Amino acid sequence: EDMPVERILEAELAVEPNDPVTNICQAADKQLFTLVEWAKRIPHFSELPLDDQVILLRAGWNELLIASFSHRSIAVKDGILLATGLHVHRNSAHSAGVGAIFDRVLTELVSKMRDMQMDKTELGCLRAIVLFNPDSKGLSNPAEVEALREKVYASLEAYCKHKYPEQPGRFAKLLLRLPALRSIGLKCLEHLFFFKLIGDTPIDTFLMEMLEAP
């Protein structure tokens, strides 16, 4: 109820028109501020208690950002396009020690998003589903978050089948990329925590705040 895909699509269009690792961390920090402005544009999100808004974002930021630069890199050859306008080629990532995780992003996300031609509306809805993670610990009202999530995928499915009537399995195919997103998210965080530990690799304030406890 009251979860039009048009509003979700608008949120996407509104926020987005030498060590590769350092470039990635700087881009993540920059995009974190934008993530907040994007979340605010997602229907009913801002109406949630401030505390729950913090929980949802702290719990989904990495997956939310990974989903965005991955879809943004669909046209890119063998690599990704950072929000800073910089390109990180698969070989550059490999020569920095993050080749394994980088390839997972290209194989499981980038490539797959390209094969099915995932559009911005679908992308936005998937990110909205991630944002509304009912499993996020601390939620003062998990049931409510679960309600918003069901409205998002209810609208997404309607979008599909209607825009792509010929593809009855598109809806499920879209949701079936969430497991990979969760796995890739978790691995990327592990790397970030190691970079922070080693001391090397410059980490900005907002990104550093996200690596805080819990």
Binding site: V36, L50, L57, R58, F206, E212
Partner: peptide, 11 residues
């Protein structure tokens, strides 16, 4: 805690 985040969400 989460100083930056709270501030951005508040505005």
């Amino acid at each position: 805690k989460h100083k930056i985040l709270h501030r951005l969400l508040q505005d």
